[PDB]
Subunit: 494 residues, 4 copies
């Protein structure tokens, strides 16, 4: 049932105007993730009453109000509680057809931004501008140069922040050139490199789990931990738009960015404070100590057609080039060369067209050899980030009853069972943090370099045809070689 | 489903003191459950031996005895068949003629056995008043024993085991020539509770608890016993015992030994009992300065009368119905770790739990965090939960306290056995691990005797508290000052 | 003399200006260290050492030969180089407050820089400020105003000596007065303890070895003691001391540097800022010393009469309550050091000359009990630079029976090395642009924050100052306080 | 200079007569080790004034006084301080010719002992009789049966203790049969199985080093220790008497007994007390958790002639059978399957005809990866039991002086340079402890079984000709394959 939206905007966003410009408003990401997150933040009353959401793309628009009502509003989610606010929120959105390379079209955008900023009834003159760059990577530097050249606020009249989306190059060299191309354009402080995993409720809780608790603090090192596994599983393939993926692969898409962020949070030292800089300095520090993934210590897969025929093979896609050896699956063994993690194996898994949708972290502890031996098995801390948010500790306990034996049990915490809260999407958090000027859950220039350095030797070997890409039926668990590799790497299954 | 060892030879379970409140309320019901579980042989001989000159045994068995049996909605059809196994005998606890009469009957039952071995195993359950104990033991040893190489003889013995080190040592010396330690099964029913039996698994089958179980990670250990009930009617018995001798010396010291012991050499009985004795021998004797005592007064409204309002209770009695103690374990694992042992009657709730409180993680969260805590609740509802700090779910960067819970009533369909089912079974299976050993008993009395003597000399102050309240206010301040951080 | 000069010192001119050349510190510590670095071939042979002071001396050559050269040490090996080195020293009478005199200084440095036969046209300037604290900001303003080297023609580095204020407020003031004058990068705040061979080895002992690394936390360590003892009193310079006290003189600076190196976390690298960031970090977690957790002393005359009482000095004001002795219990509020007591000791007119670090480990209760006692890692920085670990071992022979033994390392026995003075290292490091063994602006603030509440309680007459005979071990109350604080002896 | 002997006999030995019977007095072990140790114990005033030393053997005597003066006294050591006491001590020794199998001669042995016991002027009647069995293993059970049958003291009139020398079988089965053959003859308490390593100053200090000190206690487990090495080196070969060695080998001679005792003391848990059975219970406990040595994880050698010709080859000995594959050298990798030692490699080395005489223990700790990396190396705890008794900890420190580099240093303790004490021979301690009834430094029946169980699968593989025995020149460091095996096993060289 429909209810009033509070004026709960952060006080640091009240005094001056607010213009959120979504560059690439026509794009799949903006319609599926950006505009829905803005709607939820508006409904939560976390954005000002008078925000200006400006869509800008090359798409010509015959009816912006039909696009807003039919296309945009279709992707909004809590419509049984917030369906009434759709109209009011959409009243805040405006659209603009413009190029990503022509200066006049960038003078147009700024003139509209000035026009909206002048409409403000609050105390301070000027305005704060947040730019969401949801564009194809071929136009990125074009937009950045254009925005920096003449879409910036006057000095001492409001902050200008830039939310930037992946891809961030294809390896160390291509990424480094993009970072150098952006260095004269904007300060590091104004760039907000999005990796949506850093906005997931269970990824945001890693740092608390680890450093607010002595139980995990005392155990979080090579003396107690035997193996660390990071898993990404998807039932969906890379169909329709599979030619886009052929150029990327599973390592560049999921492993380099998303699962390396989880790796940095799980392996970092305790931060000097909970400041952004202090947290990101520990993230860079550990990533700089990860030995580059080696081709011998990995397994790759590419999905074939499903047992029945429902899901077609990866190569059946017309966008996919003939005889492509692009991996849709990868399992890697990683080593962190420091005194906390010496000898602890890190198993990173990511695959498409698998048996289930999964995102979890598995901290498997050493066995307690005596006095139980075979009557016991490795404890494990499991943090499952999706489908259902849960954290559970797997242990051994006496079989309940008159029978004197052991069994495996769990000390569980299930978020759907424990809390009434309808959790926010990763993009709600991240967009909010960017408005609150909080950089901790945003990839730093050096944090990005450190990530590419782990995977580039491997990515290049793959691209040279040096690493074998094994087939697997869509809907199966992946190649059989992968489970043997996982076993041999150090992970004891349950 | 009987043990193959129990199949071969006759089995005679003799309950000495069958007319007593313990036998009817705890022994016979546990025997019924083992019989129903098919853990006892079908041709088992349960022989009640007491001073009661009762006329109608069949009426006693049907009306009195059967009334205390529990799963009658599931296994109450077997009442008749089980009761058909029970026989009764009037006899004295001091006359050889009455034990000769006992040996005579057990023999007439053993000879009736249709199995392979011509002898017969004897388990004696001594549920007697302590003034007749040595009398019975001498009588049973003199002429109620089984012939060599024709079946074992096992003696289950109930508390009290003296009142201090000297009186207990006396009793152990009186029993030494009568039976060998292996034959003696000293019952402490806490060692039969599902959560107490899981201590050893929790601690030594898991690296998570193993790594953390020492002074580097643990800040404080608390053992709690709470009862809403007072000395309701039978206050004259309690007056002579007190809360330390009743609960703390036996029950909570068993929990203390299992929580503080080193890792055993194996899961054998003596290897486990050797570690229990070892730690108890390193507990510094409780000091009168490091304790708080209470005696309950009438409840705020009047429902529960005061301890001294009981006519069985002598005038001006300074008997403690409540006690909180701080204990120190003088070894390298537990150096500096405070142990808080709590036991009281007429309190706010029924509770039996263990609290392992870990050190605070000072940085980087400071006030945004609080000590982790591993809580093991043995009753009212068998639970094990680990208290932690986590980010408040949602669109806010704050912290909150959460739990990684395991609740046995929610997780399992198993209707758990009574403490006496386990122990009686273990005694038939000849497993001594959950039975107080002669030296284990001495080590326990040595911790509390200096304190008990100080109390008995009128050296320790016994503070009043309203029945139904949390006890004296001095106790919570003592707990705080002892090392335990409240939430 | 070898050509062991660093290549950055070679291309450009080098001018080392010693401001306060007539001062006791200059003749006793600065000029002797410069001589050793010249002899070692660590300084260019065409170096310009310019003494700048208020002294109106007539004969510089006599001052250099008789006064200066008298304090030089290896003269059985380097006596022949005295002449050549002294030929590099020049002197210049001038004020610390007149711009014309600093202009005259700038004028001289430029004439010297123009005389250089090397490739570059500019010149590197190192200024050693060995001045009384009342003229400090005067000199800094004058030097910054017009004694600086042109842009892209050489670095300007400033070596600054203690006192750095008298508490947090006075120190903060001085740091703010210097902020617009020089970039922190150029400022080299000297604390000579960071140049001592045993203090320089703390970081290696601790983080290059798993034996000490595994043991360096509250689980294994029971007590940490830092000791400073001197047989010498004020002896002549009492009024000079009266205004400072033992805490401001030794404890706040010297022993807090040892405290930071002993308590810091493992650095991200061996870079200056990575090391100095861990030093600031721990100091920011030391709970401020409390007046209840300390013992103070002031020496009286020695049992016989040899050493007179502190108050017998005419420079010392009548009825002065200045402490010549202090023992303190300090707490470091972090997860590595929670519950570990830190006992910091410093006193004058005591039984012996000592500077050592004592890490006392927890007792192994069982199976030896009374047959054993706490292990101890002792690092003695002077009189005889050594490191030894105190342990329990079986009594050798047909007995059993335990005894206390040591696994020793004595530097004068094991090495033929004749170690450099603390000032040789640091002066060298300042020329090499290495800031790791120099007090950072924030590192200084963090140090004063520990002692200022206590220093103020002392200055308000709130803390009792107990007497002790010169040559004794100090007040008896101090030993009992040490015992009660957590330290056990035998 | 010559001085009076004190009456420093332990009070428990003062009360009743003492008869030390050396069975096999003509033997090389008695003349080289037993009688010299007795002389030192007599000189120390640790034996009664009126002891009776009775030599018993098969060897006919032509002049006992000449054997005593010329042969026996020749092996006595401190003759510049104790040369004057030689006469007085030798006056206590008597000799007896007799068999090791005929009862007739054991009745004579009992007859002489009672005669000596009756001569006692002290309080208590009867006598304490210590039997030192220095016999060839073919007569062992013969002697034990004879001594038990009728050379035992009357009940409640004095203890009868038996010192028994190696060999204790050749594997588990042969050892077990010998222990069962002795079970009805004597109680375990009365048997004192000698392993002379348990009498060495540095071996006796292991237990103190480890459990009286928190520095070593905290560090003594898999979290800090990377590798543990036990070394035995001898310059001597099997010169003249090779026939006896051929039947034994280096594993049965040194590794199974001597170095496994060092292994048990280095790996055991902390004892419940310093009582004999509390210490011996921990020794059995760890030995019962050592995985049996595997043929794949070992290197064997047999010495050839020295580079010059001084020391001849092992096979050049006529006592040595033709084409013998007996190992004079062995290096093994051992694993202790418990939570303290999981993953820690144990390297056990023993060889004859090597470069030097050595007996040392090396406890190599894990590297400290950061911040020093290559500027540092693994710390090590070295306990050298002979030639010179030193204990030293190897560490990294700053190079003294101006130079800001690192170097390797030591925190040393050398016993000849820190104590004035002329240390006793291993046999002085052990004989003394046997008189003082202290069993802690004597192999227990179960401790012996646990030792054989580690080496028997390997010994049998060797005896079946399944393990390769590599040659090495006498005086060299052994086969080159051994140093590569040591490296690969986990030990990082100096
Ligand atoms: Cl197809
Ligand atoms: Cl989901
Ligand atoms: Cl839950
Ligand atoms: Cl490459
Ligand atoms: Cl004790
Ligand atoms: Cl909750
Ligand atoms: Cl649950
Ligand atoms: Cl016992
Ligand atoms: Cl008492
Ligand atoms: Cl703080
Ligand atoms: Cl010195
Ligand atoms: Cl010494
Ligand atoms: Cl030395
Ligand atoms: Cl203040
Ligand atoms: Cl005679
Ligand atoms: Cl005997
Ligand atoms: Cl044997
Ligand atoms: Cl054992
Ligand atoms: Cl085992
Ligand atoms: Cl030697
Ligand atoms: Cl030495
Ligand atoms: Cl055993
Ligand atoms: Cl075999």
């Amino acid at each position: 049932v429909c209810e009033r939206i509070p004026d709960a905007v952060s006080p640091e966003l009240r005094s001056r105007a607010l213009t959120i410009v979504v560059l690439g408003a026509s794009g799949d990401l903006a319609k599926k993730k950006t505009f829905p997150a803005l709607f939820q933040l508006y409904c939560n009353g976390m954005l000002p009453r008078d925000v200006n959401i400006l869509g800008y793309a090359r798409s010509t628009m015959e009816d912006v109000e039909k696009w807003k009502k039919d296309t945009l509003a279709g992707f909004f989610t809590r419509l049984d509680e917030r369906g009434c606010h759709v109209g009011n929120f959409l009243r805040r959105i405006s659209y603009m057809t413009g190029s990503y390379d022509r200066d006049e079209d960038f003078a147009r955008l700024n003139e509209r931004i000035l026009r909206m900023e002048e409409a403000f009834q609050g105390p301070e003159k000027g305005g704060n501008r947040l730019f969401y760059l949801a564009l194809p990577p071929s136009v990125f530097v074009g937009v950045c140069r254009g925005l920096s050249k003449g879409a910036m606020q006057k000095p001492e009249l409001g902050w200008v922040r830039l939310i930037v989306e992946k891809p961030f190059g294809r390896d160390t060299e291509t990424s480094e050139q993009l970072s150098n191309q952006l260095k004269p354009l904007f300060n590091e402080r104004q760039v907000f490199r999005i990796d949506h995993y850093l906005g997931k409720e269970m990824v945001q809780n890693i740092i608390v789990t680890r450093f607010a608790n002595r139980v995990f603090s005392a155990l979080w090192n090579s003396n107690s931990i035997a193996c660390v596994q990071i898993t990404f599983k998807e039932k969906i393939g890379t169909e329709g738009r599979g030619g886009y993926f052929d150029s990327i692969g599973i390592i560049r898409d999921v492993i380099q960015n998303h699962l390396t962020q989880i790796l940095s949070l799980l392996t970092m030292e305790k931060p000097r404070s909970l400041s952004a800089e202090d947290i990101r300095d520990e993230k860079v520090q550990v990533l700089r100590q990860v030995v580059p993934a080696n081709p011998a210590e990995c397994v790759l897969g590419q999905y074939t057609a499903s047992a029945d025929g429902s899901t077609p093979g990866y190569l059946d896609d017309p966008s996919v080039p003939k005889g492509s050896h692009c991996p849709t699956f990868a399992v890697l063994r990683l080593h962190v060369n420091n005194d906390r993690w010496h000898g602890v194996p890190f198993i990173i898994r990511a695959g498409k067209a698998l048996e289930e949708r999964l995102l979890d972290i598995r901290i498997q502890f050493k066995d307690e050899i005596r006095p139980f031996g075979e009557s016991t098995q490795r404890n494990e801390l499991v943090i499952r980030a999706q489908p259902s948010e849960a954290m559970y500790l797997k242990l051994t306990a006496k079989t309940p009853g008159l029978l004197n034996d052991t069994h495996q049990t769990e000390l569980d915490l299930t978020y759907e069972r424990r809390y009434d809260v309808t959790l926010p999407d990763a993009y709600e958090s991240l967009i909010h943090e960017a408005l609150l000027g909080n950089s901790t859950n945003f990839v730093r220039v050096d944090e990005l370099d450190a990530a590419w350095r782990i995977y580039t030797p491997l990515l290049h070997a793959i691209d040279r045809g040096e690493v074998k890409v094994l087939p697997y039926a869509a809907g199966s668990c992946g190649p059989e070689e992968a489970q043997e590799f996982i076993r041999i790497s150090g992970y004891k299954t349950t």
